[PDB]
Chains A and B, each alone.
Chain A
Amino acid sequence: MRKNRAPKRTVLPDPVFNNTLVTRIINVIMEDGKKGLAQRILYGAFDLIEQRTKEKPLTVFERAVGNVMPRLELRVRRIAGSNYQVPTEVPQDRKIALALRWIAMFARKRHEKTMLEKIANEIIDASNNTGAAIKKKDDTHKMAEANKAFAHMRW
């Protein structure tokens, strides 16, 4: 009942590593509209990644996001009682957006010290397929695999 598809604004390439995902995750960890503070958090986390992993921070970040990045989504559809879920293949853009959102949400909840180290350690843990965003992706994947039967009927 809208019959119009929304436009899309430019993502902008990052001006340090020339990787758009860096700008995307900056905007995701944005709070109170503080671009400077978000950029400081990201670059400090990347420097801590340099100090710890002894590898390229952009490569480590890509290895983390690609591993956290899900495949199936379960859409809620109620008919009579409760909701029976529906597995659908997601577009690549929404796939990346969900990966970044999960990364930030599970990074801002860990027990550690300053958010710099928080997000840095979350990224290094997700780089090895052992983390909280990993658990989230596993849970949604297993739920979709369980409710594979109703995949044919969507709406």
Chain B
Amino acid sequence: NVSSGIIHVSCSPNNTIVSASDPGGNVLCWASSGTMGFKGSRKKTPYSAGIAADKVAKTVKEMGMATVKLFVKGTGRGKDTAIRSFANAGLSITEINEKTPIPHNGCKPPKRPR
């Protein structure tokens, strides 16, 4: 019932999440590779991210919005598959802002696996 909104596309290296939300807080729908039905390691493939983006795009288009600001987050692999899925869905993409957390040399990261 709202024309403009935000789409948070978080791409973890292990999984992906797409949350369609009102311009200020109050997420309106959400989807992820797990809710798609993919399980285990298949959740981290770009195709699963595209599937999740397509489902959420169809859902929110039937809900009836037009303009989307796409907030890209994380450092996965299928970071652009969701972008192309939304573009193919056809919602008016206005902004491509990226908001993956960057630190200013605070907090100690985990150990390096070997």
Contacts and interface: CB of A to CB of B under 8 A. Distances in A.
Direct contact of A and B (CB under 8 A): yes
Determine the main DSSP class of B at the interface with A. Answer: helix
B45 interface: yes
Interface residues of B, number: 5
Counting contact residues on chain A (CB < 8 A from B), the size range is under 10
A17 interface: no
A148 interface: yes
Contacts of B48: 149
Contacts of A148: 47
Interface in A102-155: 148-150, 152
Nearest to B48: A149
Contacts of B84: none
8 contacts: A148-B47, A149-B42, A149-B45, A149-B47, A149-B48, A150-B45, A152-B46, A152-B47
Interface of A: 148-150, 152
* Nearest 8 pairs of A and B residues by beta carbon: A149-B47, A149-B45, A149-B42, A148-B47, A149-B48, A150-B45, A152-B46, A152-B47
